[PDB]
Design an enzyme around this catalytic site. Sequence first.
Site, PDB file in Angstrom:
ATOM      1  N   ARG A   1      24.899  26.496  -1.427  1.00  0.00           N
ATOM      2  CA  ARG A   1      25.615  27.485  -0.640  1.00  0.00           C
ATOM      3  C   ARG A   1      25.347  28.862  -1.224  1.00  0.00           C
ATOM      4  O   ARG A   1      25.540  29.083  -2.427  1.00  0.00           O
ATOM      5  CB  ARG A   1      27.126  27.185  -0.627  1.00  0.00           C
ATOM      6  CG  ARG A   1      28.032  28.191   0.063  1.00  0.00           C
ATOM      7  CD  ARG A   1      27.743  28.322   1.547  1.00  0.00           C
ATOM      8  NE  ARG A   1      28.821  29.059   2.219  1.00  0.00           N
ATOM      9  CZ  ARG A   1      28.862  30.388   2.347  1.00  0.00           C
ATOM     10  NH1 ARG A   1      27.928  31.131   1.759  1.00  0.00           N
ATOM     11  NH2 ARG A   1      29.906  30.975   2.963  1.00  0.00           N
TER      12      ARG A   1
ATOM     13  N   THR B   1      27.666  33.598   6.711  1.00  0.00           N
ATOM     14  CA  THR B   1      27.022  33.631   8.010  1.00  0.00           C
ATOM     15  C   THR B   1      27.992  33.055   9.066  1.00  0.00           C
ATOM     16  O   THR B   1      28.902  32.302   8.711  1.00  0.00           O
ATOM     17  CB  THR B   1      25.630  32.933   7.981  1.00  0.00           C
ATOM     18  OG1 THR B   1      25.731  31.595   7.484  1.00  0.00           O
ATOM     19  CG2 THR B   1      24.634  33.687   7.080  1.00  0.00           C
TER      20      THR B   1
ATOM     21  N   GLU C   1      29.090  30.297  11.746  1.00  0.00           N
ATOM     22  CA  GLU C   1      28.733  28.916  12.018  1.00  0.00           C
ATOM     23  C   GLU C   1      27.852  28.973  13.238  1.00  0.00           C
ATOM     24  O   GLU C   1      28.021  29.859  14.083  1.00  0.00           O
ATOM     25  CB  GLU C   1      29.985  28.051  12.270  1.00  0.00           C
ATOM     26  CG  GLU C   1      30.961  28.017  11.081  1.00  0.00           C
ATOM     27  CD  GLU C   1      30.422  27.188   9.922  1.00  0.00           C
ATOM     28  OE1 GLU C   1      29.644  26.231  10.182  1.00  0.00           O
ATOM     29  OE2 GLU C   1      30.757  27.513   8.763  1.00  0.00           O
TER      30      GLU C   1
ATOM     31  N   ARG D   1      28.444  21.627  -3.621  1.00  0.00           N
ATOM     32  CA  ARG D   1      27.325  22.507  -3.270  1.00  0.00           C
ATOM     33  C   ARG D   1      27.099  23.440  -4.422  1.00  0.00           C
ATOM     34  O   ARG D   1      28.052  24.056  -4.937  1.00  0.00           O
ATOM     35  CB  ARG D   1      27.607  23.292  -1.981  1.00  0.00           C
ATOM     36  CG  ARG D   1      27.956  22.388  -0.791  1.00  0.00           C
ATOM     37  CD  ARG D   1      28.181  23.207   0.480  1.00  0.00           C
ATOM     38  NE  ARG D   1      29.327  24.120   0.381  1.00  0.00           N
ATOM     39  CZ  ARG D   1      29.669  24.981   1.355  1.00  0.00           C
ATOM     40  NH1 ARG D   1      28.919  25.060   2.474  1.00  0.00           N
ATOM     41  NH2 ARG D   1      30.738  25.779   1.208  1.00  0.00           N
TER      42      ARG D   1
HETATM   43  C1  THP Z   1      30.433  30.920  -1.025  1.00  0.00           C
HETATM   44  C2  THP Z   1      31.542  30.046  -1.582  1.00  0.00           C
HETATM   45  C3  THP Z   1      32.249  29.149  -0.757  1.00  0.00           C
HETATM   46  N1  THP Z   1      33.242  28.398  -1.305  1.00  0.00           N
HETATM   47  C4  THP Z   1      34.057  27.470  -0.500  1.00  0.00           C
HETATM   48  C5  THP Z   1      35.296  28.275  -0.037  1.00  0.00           C
HETATM   49  C6  THP Z   1      35.586  27.712   1.341  1.00  0.00           C
HETATM   50  O1  THP Z   1      36.420  26.563   1.080  1.00  0.00           O
HETATM   51  P1  THP Z   1      37.350  25.871   2.217  1.00  0.00           P
HETATM   52  O2  THP Z   1      36.487  25.435   3.382  1.00  0.00           O
HETATM   53  O3  THP Z   1      37.962  24.736   1.397  1.00  0.00           O
HETATM   54  O4  THP Z   1      38.332  26.976   2.503  1.00  0.00           O
HETATM   55  C7  THP Z   1      34.231  27.240   1.871  1.00  0.00           C
HETATM   56  C8  THP Z   1      33.551  28.274   2.780  1.00  0.00           C
HETATM   57  O5  THP Z   1      32.167  28.008   2.845  1.00  0.00           O
HETATM   58  P2  THP Z   1      31.465  27.721   4.235  1.00  0.00           P
HETATM   59  O6  THP Z   1      31.388  29.051   4.940  1.00  0.00           O
HETATM   60  O7  THP Z   1      30.072  27.143   3.917  1.00  0.00           O
HETATM   61  O8  THP Z   1      32.362  26.791   5.015  1.00  0.00           O
HETATM   62  O9  THP Z   1      33.442  26.979   0.696  1.00  0.00           O
HETATM   63  C9  THP Z   1      33.596  28.499  -2.695  1.00  0.00           C
HETATM   64  O10 THP Z   1      34.529  27.786  -3.186  1.00  0.00           O
HETATM   65  N2  THP Z   1      32.943  29.349  -3.515  1.00  0.00           N
HETATM   66  C10 THP Z   1      31.950  30.133  -3.020  1.00  0.00           C
HETATM   67  O11 THP Z   1      31.385  30.897  -3.824  1.00  0.00           O
HETATM   68 CA    CA Z   2      29.378  30.084   6.869  1.00  0.00          CA
END
Ligand code: THP
Ligand code: CA
Length: 129
Positions: A29, A35, A37, A75
Amino acid sequence: LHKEPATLIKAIDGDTVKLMYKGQPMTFRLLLVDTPEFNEKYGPEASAFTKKMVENAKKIEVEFDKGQRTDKYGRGLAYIYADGKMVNEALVRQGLAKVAYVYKGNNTHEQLLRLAEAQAKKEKLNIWS
Ligand SMILES: Cc1cn([C@H]2C[C@H](OP(=O)(O)O)[C@@H](COP(=O)(O)O)O2)c(=O)[nH]c1=O
Ligand SMILES: [Ca+2]
């Protein structure tokens, strides 16, 4: 921070990709970006942009920051480079991602990305149009 080699397996969407890292497929990630969805406006364009950038690269690198290295979903959280060009930066600069999240000590490139976002916003590009 240091760049480590990796190999593209599959681009997933605008901010998530699957790489061979340390002999195993791993989802990454992108740090400090969000971005849309694929089901949202500019989501398909953000997917397409990342896909082309990573598929066309000769060399992919992963650079972990100084904070937590994986999210709760397993991730890897990294800056990704395609032939030395940061994908996280390129997306924000193109107005295809917003600067986001910014925590658990992973902020090394925050300013660089915010500078990119301001320029995209000043140009009213894509997300900002
Ligand atoms: C970019 C990033 C996302 N995330 C987690 C937070 C969000 O969690 P929740 O879904 O549990 O709220 C989710 C958002 O990423 P996505 O945009 O890929 O869904 O991934 C982190 O924990 N740390 C990070 O640095
Ligand atoms: Ca996203």
